[PDB]
């Protein structure tokens, strides 16, 4: 049941995002309701999350592949819908496996950002 409910919720989110994308392209992302901005952000993360590096495309991707167990797929997406990962950067979900990989990539991005901020601050 948990698998079914999560899948339907993801589809509903993506369906709504597609409809909102029509408005976004013409006018702009900043001409939307504040509620719809949250949906857009979650949908974009979902789209990025759906991507996965395959073990057969280590040449075209340049990255090690992943095998995601179904139980991790359900848990990772279910948490994302709840919004517990809103703070995570959008790109952290791109070309990764389970939620754990997302967090690890976010940590590395945060460390790099902190290093850049330190370099900028030290420049003063």
């Amino acid at each position: 049941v948990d698998h079914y409910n999560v899948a339907q919720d993801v589809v509903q989110m993506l369906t709504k995002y597609r409809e909102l994308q029509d408005i976004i392209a013409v006018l702009g992302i900043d001409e939307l309701s504040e509620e719809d901005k949250l949906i857009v952000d979650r949908a974009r993360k979902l789209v990025k999350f759906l991507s996965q590096p395959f073990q057969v495309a280590e040449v075209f991707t340049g990255m090690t592949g992943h095998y995601v167990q179904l139980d991790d797929t359900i848990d990772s997406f279910s948490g994302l819908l709840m919004g517990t990962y809103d703070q995570v950067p959008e790109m952290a979900f791109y070309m990764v496996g389970g939620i754990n990989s997302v967090l690890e990539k976010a940590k590395k991005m945060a460390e790099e950002a902190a290093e850049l901020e330190k370099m900028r601050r030290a420049r003063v």
Binding site: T84, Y85, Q87, V88, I99, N100, L103, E104, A106, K107, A110, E111, A113, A114, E117, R121
Partner: peptide, 30 residues
Amino acid sequence: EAAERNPTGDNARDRLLKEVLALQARINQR
């Protein structure tokens, strides 16, 4: 008060999430 008398995989996700949130907060400070 009477409650006082008588009375791990998910933890890793929580631990990682806390660390990332801490880093994102630290960078903001300075």
